[PDB]
Structure formats: C-alpha cells, structure tokens
Symmetry: D3
Subunit: 92 residues, 6 copies
C-alpha cells in the first residue's frame, strides 16, 4: 500500500537511518525490561510490608509507582524525539 507515502511529512530513508531508529527501539526494549523489573520489586516490597503500617505509610508517601510511571513516559517520549531527529519528517 505504501501507506506511509499517504501520510504528510513522509521522507525517504536510508538504511543507516533505519538502523539508527531500530537501535533506539532496541535500547528502549532494554529500558522496558528494566522498568518491569523495578515494578516487580515494588510489588514485592509492598507485599512484604503488609501489616507494617509505618512501612506501608512510608511507601505511600514515597509514591514509587507514580515515579516509575513518570520515568516510563519520559523514556518513551525521549525515544520518540531521538527518532524524529533521525527520520526528520517534513512537517510541523
């Protein structure tokens, strides 16, 4: 379909550009694995700390699940910006 040629901003890309975009994506998958690992650590920390009210309150005050979510969003939009720097669409 060459669907991309139907989207505004399309630019033809070299293999080097594609490889660089794929590299950002592969590095991102390593961050995704790391984030899943941190999330499992947090789930365990909470489970172990059940019934310890002071530690449950400490975890709630630290808001680690929220901070992990912020980090995930920043990593992903950062990847998107690096890829746009490579792909260089001809649109605003």
């Amino acid at each position: 379909d060459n669907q991309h040629k139907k989207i505004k901003g399309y630019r033809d890309l070299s293999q080097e550009e594609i490889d660089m975009m794929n590299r950002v994506k592969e590095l991102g998958s390593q961050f995704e694995k790391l984030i899943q690992d941190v999330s499992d650590h947090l789930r365990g920390q909470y489970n172990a700390s059940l019934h310890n009210r002071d530690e449950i309150t400490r975890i709630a005050n630290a808001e680690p699940g929220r901070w992990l979510a912020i980090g995930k969003t920043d990593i992903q939009t950062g990847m998107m910006a690096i890829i746009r720097a490579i792909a260089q669409p001809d649109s605003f």
Copy 2:
C-alpha cells in the same frame, strides 16, 4: 563525612536497590553513546549538504538538533524518575 545523611530525605539502601540504580545509569550510558552517534550523523549530513540550499533548508526546517536535544532531556529526566522510584526519598 556521610554527607548524604546530612540531606533531607535520606533513606538507607539495600545492595539490590543500589544495583538497580546502577543498572539505570548503565543503560543511560548506552543512550548517551547512541545520542553522540546521532549527533555525529547530523554533523555529517549538514557538511555533505553544504552548498545544496534546498537540502540545507530541509535540514533547518526539520530541526533535528533540537529534536535530539529534547530526546536527551527526556531520557535523562526519565532515568531520574526511575531512580527516585527505587531510592524512595522521604521528602516532597
């Protein structure tokens, strides 16, 4: 000096927590290498395209150096948020 114990929010950390923070940092160094690589690609692209006004205008309109900078800032603040999710400082 135990300087960190002089900073508000200090919490004692386990080795697992330190290892996880170091992992985020090591993955970040891979992104830093990737960003330096993209930046060199851009420098070459501009050099090759000197005197080709239409392509110099295309590069200026795509603003790839700006987009790369945005991506770097997002990757770094994302790392900071994941590390805070691990370290869990006891402060706002």
Copy 3:
C-alpha cells in the same frame, strides 16, 4: 522500498487512521501559522520599544520568546502523542 516495514513497530493502517493522522497534522500547520504570527508581533514590540529602557526591561523580564518556544514544543509533542494514539505502534 516499503521502508516502514523495515522499522520495528510497523502496523498496517486503514484509510480512516491515515485521515485522522493527516487531520492532526493539518491542525498543527494552523498552530504553526499562529506561532509565526505571535513571533512577528514580538519582533515588532521589541522594535517599537527600542530606546525605551523600562519597556525593554519589561519585555526581557517577561521572556515572551522563551514562552512561545515552550508552547511550540508542547504543541508539537502533543501532536506526536495523538498520532501515536492513532497509529498504535507495536513497540515500547
């Protein structure tokens, strides 16, 4: 070349999806025109105010060129996020 099929995350798209992505892009071009208009207003404001030190200091303290730049970056990354919500790449 079907270059996009060489990029990780590729998904086939319907015409409706392409139309929606093009609509975001067209609305973005209206914002780009608006931002260029505001930038010209600022250039005039500064020119008129040359030699009026108090008003030059007021403009420098308000930092309108910086705020306009922040707005441009937010509009553009917002467009990128809406387009990802439509295109739904199969990658992190």
Copy 4:
C-alpha cells in the same frame, strides 16, 4: 470588580493581544474536537475487538488511551505557554 487587577502580574492588554489569545483558544477548541473524535474511534475499536483476545492484547500493549491523554495535556500546556507569551505577566 476588576478582579484581575487584584492578581499579581496584571498587565493591561490591547485588543490585538486579546484577539491573539482568543485565536489560540479557538484553535484549541478544534484540537479538543479532534481529541474527542479520536477517543470515540478508540472506544469503537475496543468494542469491535471484544472477544478477539489477540487484538485486545494488541490494544492494551499499544496503550492508545494513555497516549491520547498525554497529547491532550501537551496541547493544553502549549496553549498556556503561547498565551503567556502574548499576555506577558509581570511575575515569575
């Protein structure tokens, strides 16, 4: 009440400045309509895909509702920054 004169940062505005602020707001309402349209598309996509587990998993992995929400927040804060570039409050 002239309530705005009770808020720090107040600056008197010209009609041109008000018109420009209203234009950003009107362009924003077009983006709000577009975002509502994308949200309805997503609701349909999910409904059609109910019982197709592989496609429900694809949608959940793509997180399009989250990405649309990120785009909405960026469009709105971008509007706020362009308006501050026009209005130029005399405060930090």
Copy 5:
C-alpha cells in the same frame, strides 16, 4: 556504609552545597503544604456543589484535580533539576 559512594556519579559535597539542596527541599515543603490546601478547597467546592448539576458539570469540565496534579509533578521535577544543578553528579 557510605552507600552513596557505591552509586555511580557520586561527588563529594561541600556544606554550602548541602545547605542549598536543603533550602530547595524546604521551599518544596511549603509548596506541598500549599498543594494540600488547594486540594482541600477543591474537596469543599465539590461538596457544596453536590446536587447543583450545572456547577458539578462546570467543575468536571474545568478538571481542577487533574491540573493540581500536573502542577505538583512539575514542582517536584523542578526541585529535582535544581538539586542536580547543585549536586552535579558525574553521570549522564
């Protein structure tokens, strides 16, 4: 344990640097108090307005709890960036 010396990026800090970091943190606690105050105002506003459908719809359309949450996240990441400007870790 000198745990911080086990984290990459560690740099020794002066008392002035620690005092400056503590000041950012103390100013942050004032913002946290302010945000809690605004949140209580919103809870009251909603309670008073129960049964007034037009005003409940106005509040839902204004999304003040969402905007307050965005402000909290920006204040906190801003604090983190100022503290990094002071602490100057030797890592990406």
Copy 6:
C-alpha cells in the same frame, strides 16, 4: 476595560481564590530568589575553576546551567498549573 471579560474562559473569582493565586505567586518569588542564588554560585564556581582544566571539564560535563534552567521551567509551569486548578477557566 474589564479586559478579562473579553477573554474566553473568564470566570468570576472569589477573594479566597485570588488569595490562593497570590500565595502561589509569592512562593514562586521565593523560588526565583533561590534560583538566582544558585546561578550566582555557579558563576563563582566557574570563575574559581578557570585554568583548572579538569575541573572546567567536570563542570561542562555536569551541565549545571542547563539543569538549573530545566528546574526553573518546571517550577514556573507547575505554578501555572496550580493556578489553573484554582482559577478554573471554562475553556480547553
């Protein structure tokens, strides 16, 4: 002129709402003073370190002026979001 009534989104405000907005602004001026203080510290640090190439390279690698600028932008947009949570404009 009641200029604000000419801007879309206008809502009448109570004195409590105005006081809360002014409080955010006053707390912001304390952050602005703190940021100016950190900026002066950085200027001194650089001056003292002139001719010490290793320390000049350390400062350049830490990018503290950039991080301080990021923090300033986050503090200011955070203030803007808290104020919108108070003022609750009737527009997107």
